[model samples]
Target chain A: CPLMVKVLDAVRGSPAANVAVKVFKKAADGTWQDFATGKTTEFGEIHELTTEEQFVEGVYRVEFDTSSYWKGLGLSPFHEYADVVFTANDSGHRHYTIAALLSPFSYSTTAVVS
Target chain B: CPLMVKVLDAVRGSPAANVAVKVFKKAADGTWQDFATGKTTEFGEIHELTTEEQFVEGVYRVEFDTSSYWKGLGLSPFHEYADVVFTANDSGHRHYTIAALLSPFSYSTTAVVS
Candidate 1:
C-alpha cells in the first residue's frame, strides 16, 4: 500500500500536465509542514510524493498549484489553487489515493483510504 | 430553468440535514453579493435559493455552513464551510445546480449549468 495523487482536467479529458503538487503532513499544532513536492507528467499524477513506506497516522494536506493550468486554458479561476485535507487513520497498511477532477470554475475530489 | 443547491454527507450517505445554504451573485468588481439564503430540509436541498425567474448570466457562488454538521458528529473539520463558484453562461434559460458531498476532513462539489 502506497500513496498517490492523480489529477486531471475534467473539462478537456486530459491530464493536468506539469502542475506543481505539494504534500504536507500536518503538525501537532495544526500547521501543515511540507513533506514533498512533485509535478505531474503526461498523466497528471504524483507517484513521487511517497514510496512504499507508509506515513505515520495523521492529517495531511495536498496543495495543487493550478494557476498555470487555468492560464493554459485561458480562464480566470475563482480558486488559484486547491487544497485537499484528509487524515491517515490507523487502518493498517493501505493504499491512499486522492484523485481530483479540476476545471477553471469548479473542482471535485475523491479520496480513498484502503 | 431554476437554480437549486443540494448537499449531502458522503460518508453517511444522507443529505446534509438542516444545513445553512447561501447564494451570492458575483458583482462586476469580483465581489460576491448575497442574493438569497435557505436551509436544507430533511432532504438536504435548497429550493428556496431561487425562483422560476432566470438570473442574468454571471458568476455566482454557493456557500454551505457545515460547522453544525461536523460538531454534531463529534469530529474536527478542516473547513467550517464550503464554497462552490461557477459561471452562469448565456447558453439559455437552464437549471443551475450545485451539489456537494461533505465530511469532516474532505469535501467534493459539482455544478451543473444547463
Candidate 2:
C-alpha cells in the first residue's frame, strides 16, 4: 500500500501558504520513524495528501513543523503545535486529503477523504 | 458583573444553526452551577455570545447539548460534544464572545473580545 500526505502553513488572519511538512509512522515500540517529507505548492495551501495505493489497516500520525515555518515571520507558540493522528482501514486504492484553516491563535482540521 | 454565553449547533456539510446554549460557572469547591442559557436567533447559528458587563474574574464553562440537537434531524455523534472553558482576568468593563463552526465530525472555538 502507498500513502501520500500534505501539510499547509496557515498564518493567523491570512490565507494558508505552502510549507515544509514531515511525515512519521509510529512503530510498534511507540517510536516515530520518518516516512516522507514534502512542501505544498502555492495552490496547495490546504495540505492535500493522497496515498499512491490504499493504506494498510494501521494507525498513523502527521506532524506539522509549525515552529520553524513561523519563525521567519517572528511568530512563536502559534496556538499549540498542530498534530493530527488518524487510522487508515482500507485495503484498496484510495486517496486521503486533509485541510487546515490556520491563524495565530487557533487552527482547524478535517478529514477530506478516507 | 454579568456574563452571557451562547451555543450554536453545526450540521455536517452545512452551516451552523442557533441552537440552545447553557452556561455554568465553576464554584471554588469544584462544582458547576447553572448561570444562564439561551438560543441563537436565525443569524446566531455561529453562536456569537456577548456579555453586557465584565464577567467576574473566575473560571467558566459552556456546554452545548449536541446529541439532542442533531438527533431531531436524524444525525448521530455529530462529532464530540463541544465545551469551552476560559478565565476572566479583567476588572474593567469587558465583553467576551465565542463562536463555533461545527460539523458531524469536528468543531472549532475561539475567544473574541476578551
Candidate 3:
C-alpha cells in the first residue's frame, strides 16, 4: 500500500476504531473523483487505501466521518466531518501515513511521508 | 483572552513562527463572520486570539496560512490552507488552545479546552 491512515481518539486516548474513511483524487477536469474508501480496523488503521501504481502524482483528500463516531459514543460533536487534503507523489513515489487525532469538538491531522 | 493557538513545523520539528491565523464565528444566519486574526510569535503561539466575553457559544473556524510558511522556506506545498472548525462554549465558558503540526504537504490539528 502506498497510502494509509491512522486515527486516534484524543478524548479517549486510544485508537479510534471503526471510523469511516473516504479517499478522493482530483481529476484533470478539476473534479474530485472517488478513489478508495475503507474503515479503520480495531487498531484504528487503514493500511491499504491504495496501491503505488494506482496512487500516482495527484491531489488527494481523505474524509473521516467523525460526527457519526461521536454520536455512536453517545456524545455530540462539532464538525460534520474531518478532512485532510494534500498533494501526493509530487517529488517521487513515497509511503505516506495520514495520522489524525480526534476529539468531540476538534481534530488534528499530520502526515508522515517516506 | 480565552482562545490561543500553537503551531509547530513537523518537518523541521520546531515552532512555526510568523504563520498567519484567522478566526471566524458563525453567525445566526450561518455566515462565518470574522472575529479575530493574528500571527504566531517566535514561539509559534498566539496567547490572546479572543476575549472570553466575545467568545460566546457558537461555531468557530480557524484558518492557518500554511502554504505561506512552506513558501517562506522555499518549498511548494499542497493545499491552499488548513482549517479547523468546531463549536465553542456549548457546555460552559472555557479556555481553548488549538495546536497544529504542519508539514509541507500535511498538517495535524488538535484542541485542548479547559
Candidate 4:
C-alpha cells in the first residue's frame, strides 16, 4: 500500500502540476504493460496506481508528456518525451518511489525504495 | 568571469567528492575544445576554469568519469559515461553553473545562471 512516483519543476521549485504521466511494467515477454496513468497536482505528485498490480523485482518505466504542458504555454519544449527507467525491487515499502525534475531544455529524475 | 561547474552525489546529500570532471567549450566551428579538467574537492566542485579561453554565447559540455569512482569502490555502476550538453549565455553570472546528481542506475542534473 506504499506510494510510488513524484515529479517536480526544478526551475520554479514546485510540483510540475498537470503534466500527463504514465507508468508501465515490463512483462516477461519484453513488452511494456501500462500499469497506471494520471496527471500531477500543482506540486507535481502521483501515488500508487492501485493495489491490483503485483509488484515484483524487475525493470519499470515512467514517462512524462512535457510537450503537452508547454503547448499550453505556447512554447515548444526541446524534448517531446521524458523517460526514466529503473530497477524496481520490493524490499522495504514493498513498492518504489521515483521523482522527476523537468524544464523546457533539461530534465532529471531520482529514485528510491521507501 | 563568473564561476562554472559543480557535481553532487545525491544519495549522500554532499559533493560527489574526488570524481574527475572535464569542461569543454564549443567553438563557432562546431568542435568542442577542452577548457579545463579537475576533480571535485571534498565538496564536489569546480570554479572559473580560466580567463584565457574567453567565454561566449554558445554551447558547452560537462563530462564526468563515474566509472572510475565506482571501480575503486568495487561496484560496477550502470552508466559508462554521464554527459550534460547545455547552452551557455552570459546573462547575470555571465557564465553557467551546472550540478549533476549521480547514482548507480539513475542520474540527474540542474543548471542555473546565478
Candidate 5:
C-alpha cells in the first residue's frame, strides 16, 4: 500500500474507530475523480488505501467524515468535514501515513511520509 | 490573548517562520466575519491572536497561507492553503494552543486546550 491513515480521538484519548475516509485524485481537467474509500479500524488505521500502481503522481484529496464522528459521540462539532489535500509521488515513490487527532471543537493532522 | 498558534515545518524539522495567519469568526448570519490577522514570528508562533474577552463561545476559523510558505522555499506544494475551524470556549474560559506541522505535500494540526 502507498497510503495509510490513523485517527485519534483527543477527547477520549483513544483511537478513533470507524471514521470514514475518502480519497480523490485530481483529473487533468481539474475535477476531483474518486479514487478510494475506507473506514478506520479499531486501531484507527486503514493500512491499504491504494497500491503504488494506482497512486501515481498527482494532486490528491483525503476527506475525513469528522462531523459524523463527533455526532456519533453525542457532540456537535464545527467543521462539516476535515480534509487534507496535496501533490503526491511527484519526485519519487513514497509512502504516506496521515495521522489526525480529533476533538469535538478542534482537530489536528500530521503526515509521516517516508 | 486566549488563543495562540505554533507551526512547524516537517520537511525542515524546524519552526515555520513568517507564515501568515488570518482569523475569522462565524457571524450570526452563518458567514465568516473577519476577526484578526497576524504573522508567525521566528519561533513560528503568534502569542496574542485574540483577547480572552474577544474569544468567546463561537465558531472560529484560522487560515494559514501555506502554499506561499512552500513557494518561498522553492517547492511546489499541494494545497492552496490550510485551515482549522472549531468552536471555542463554549464550556468555560480556557486557553488554546494550536500547533501545526507542515510538509510540502502534507500538514497536521494539534490543539492543546487548557
Candidate 6:
C-alpha cells in the first residue's frame, strides 16, 4: 500500500470542532474519484492516514473548508477555501506524518517520514 | 493606512537560507504589479510588514518557492510551488499575524487581527 497525507489547521486552542476535509483522487480514466472524508481531532491539526492498507498510488486533492470555521469565531476571512494536492507513491510500512499550523488566514503543510 | 500580511514557514531548524517569496498586486488596469520580494528570517517563519504605510487595500498574491529548500536537504517534495491569494481591507493600526508550519509536502495559511 502507498501513503496518503492529510494536512490541516484550525483556530488555536479550538479543536473538537468540524474541519471539513474532502479527499479526491484522479482515476485511470483521467477523471476524479471521491475518496474519504474526515474532520480534525481536538488539536486543530492533521489526522494522519498512514496505515499501509489505507491508500493507493495516485494524485490526491485535499480541500479544507475554512469559512465556517472562521464564521463561528465571528471573523469573516477573505478566503472561503483552501486546497492542497499531492502525489503519493511508495510502499510497505512507511511511516509518514503530515501537519499544518493554521491561523485565521494562513496555513502550511509538508510530508515527513521517520 | 491599510494592513498587509506575510505568511511563511521553512524546515524546522533551517533558516538564514533563502525561502523565495513573491508579492504581486492588481494594477489600475487590472493587471498585476510586482510589489516586493523577501525571504524568511533565521526562524523559518514570517516577517511582519505592519507599518502604517506599508500597504493599501486591494488584491494581492503571495507565492512561496519551496523546491530549492527541500532540494538542499536532499529531499524532493511533490510540490514545488505554493500560492496564496487574499483581499485586504480595513484601516489604521490593525495588527495581523500569519504563519505556516511546513514539512516536505504540505502547507496552509490564514489571517489574524488583535
Candidate that would win on TM-score: 3
Better of 2 and 4 by DockQ: 4
Model 1 chain A is weakest, by summed lDDT over 10 consecutive residues, at: A76-85
Query: Local error of candidate 4 at A58, Å?
Result: 2.7
Give the winner by TM-score: 2 or 5.
5
lDDT of candidate 1 over A65-92, digit per residue (tens): 6655777557743343455666666555
Q: Return the TM-score for each candidate structure.
A: 0.59, 0.46, 0.66, 0.52, 0.62, 0.52
Candidates in descending lDDT order:
3, 5, 1, 4, 6, 2
DockQ of each: 0.18, 0.10, 0.31, 0.14, 0.25, 0.30
Q: lDDT per model, in order?
A: 0.69, 0.52, 0.79, 0.64, 0.77, 0.55
lDDT for B39 in candidate 2 is 67
Q: Which 10 residues in a row give candidate 4 chain A its minimum summed lDDT?
A: A74-83
Worst 10 residues of 4 chain B by lDDT: B75-84
lDDT of 5: 0.77
Model 4: pairs clashing at backbone N, Cα or C within 3 Å: A15-A43, A15-A44
lDDT tens digits, residue span A1-114, model 6: 133334344455444346766667779897768877667655544455334566766666665655566766675556544456566564434454444445555566555644
lDDT by residue for model 1 (B6-72), tens: 7888767888888888778878887778888888888888665666664667766677766457665
lDDT tens digits, residue span B23-80, model 5: 8889999888999898899899987788878888888877777767877568644444
Output DockQ, candidate 2: 0.10
Model 6 chain A is weakest, by summed lDDT over 10 consecutive residues, at A1-10
Q: Compare the candidates by lDDT and give the number of the best one.
A: 3
Candidate achieving higher lDDT, 2 or 4: 4
The C-alpha RMSD of each candidate to the native structure, in angstroms, is 6.8, 8.8, 4.7, 8.1, 5.4, 6.8
TM-score of chain A of each: 0.86, 0.67, 0.90, 0.79, 0.89, 0.69
Model 6, residue B94: distance off in Å is 14
Model 1 chain B weakest lDDT span, ten residues long: B74-83
Off by over 4 Å in 3: A9-15, A24-37, A47-56, A65-82, A91-95, A101-108, B9-15, B25-35, B47-54, B71-81, B102-108
